[PDB]
Amino acid sequence: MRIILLGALVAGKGTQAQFIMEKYGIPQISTGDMLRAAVKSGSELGKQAKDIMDAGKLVTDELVIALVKERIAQEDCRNGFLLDGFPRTIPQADAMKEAGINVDYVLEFDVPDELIVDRIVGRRVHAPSGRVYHVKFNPPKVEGKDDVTGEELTTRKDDQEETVRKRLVEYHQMTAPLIGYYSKEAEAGNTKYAKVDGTKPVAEVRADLEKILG
Ligand SMILES: Nc1ncnc2c1ncn2[C@@H]1O[C@H](COP(=O)(O)OP(=O)(O)OP(=O)(O)OP(=O)(O)OP(=O)(O)OC[C@H]2O[C@@H](n3cnc4c(N)ncnc43)[C@H](O)[C@@H]2O)[C@@H](O)[C@H]1O
Numbered sequence: 504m505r506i507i508l509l510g511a512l513v514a515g516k517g518t519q520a521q522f523i524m525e526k527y528g529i530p531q532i533s534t535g536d537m538l539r540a541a542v543k544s545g546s547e548l549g550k551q552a553k554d555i556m557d558a559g560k561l562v563t564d565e566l567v568i569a570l571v572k573e574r575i576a577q578e579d580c581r582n583g584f585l586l587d588g589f590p591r592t593i594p595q596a597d598a599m600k601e602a603g604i605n606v607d608y609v610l611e612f613d614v615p616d617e618l619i620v621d622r623i624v625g626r627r628v629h630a631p632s633g634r635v636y637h638v639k640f641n642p643p644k645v646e647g648k649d650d651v652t653g654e655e656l657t658t659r660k661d662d663q664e665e666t667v668r669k670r671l672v673e674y675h676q677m678t679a680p681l682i683g684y685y686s687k688e689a690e691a692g693n694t695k696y697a698k699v700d701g702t703k704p705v706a707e708v709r710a711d712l713e714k715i716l717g
Pocket of ligand 1: 555637
């Protein structure tokens with residue numbers, strides 16, 4: 504099955520990408536996690552991306568479409584995938600359309616703008632695994648420690664408050680047009696569109712999503 508998770512910053516996309524990944528058995532394709540992984544392995548892409556990432560600027564289209572075509576192309580995206588963080592600009596969305604990749608579901612996670620800087624700045628990451636926690640809203644069972652490996656959680660440099668603010672502008676300009684995009688397509692017959700309330704309990708939203716997919 505193929506699904507795009509679209510949404511505002513911090514709305515909870517990635518926290519759900521996990522669930523959809525097991526339940527419906529498909530690769531989670533996180534451009535965030537992959538650029539961050541390229542960075543912590545000193546791969547060539549990891550030299551381009553880090554300063555941009557860090558800066559709140561979006562990485563280059565020409566580059567991220569390249570990353571993501573390589574990945575869909577691997578034998579596990581064979582029966583579907585869920586894109587988490589691709590597309591982030593109408594450029595990325597048209598390139599996927601031009602390539603002939605039509606997806607089944609587009610799910611929009613909404614959160615009211617007041618929540619966005621709180622969502623991001625209290626967010627701790629168990630770096631190796633990409634396991635995402637919120638200090639206040641979805642905490643580890645042992646503070647500071649990750650629930651599975653016992654290893655300390657960290658904070659991203661782009662989850663630093665004034666970078667969160669630079670991201671929100673870039674978002675509004677860049678990525679906000681894709682809701683319109685995917686709604687015209689769902690109108691054209693091309694996908695299904697649903698919107699989910701990113702403020703409910705991680706629990707409830709999980710349910711809201713089963714009730715959509717199956
Ligand atoms: N395609 C692309 N093109 C170019 N550059 C690209 C790109 N893709 C990536 N990049 C780049 O790399 C950088 C980062 O991109 P990326 O890494 O993809 O973005 P992100 O920082 O993970 O932010 P999102 O807004 O997508 O968060 P989310 O909705 O998944 O919510 P989350 O689960 O984290 O949740 C957030 C927090 O709140 C939590 N939470 C979730 N649900 C609830 C709830 N209901 N109640 C309370 N807390 C909750 C979480 O536990 C956590 O604490 C960019 O700056 C850009 O440079």
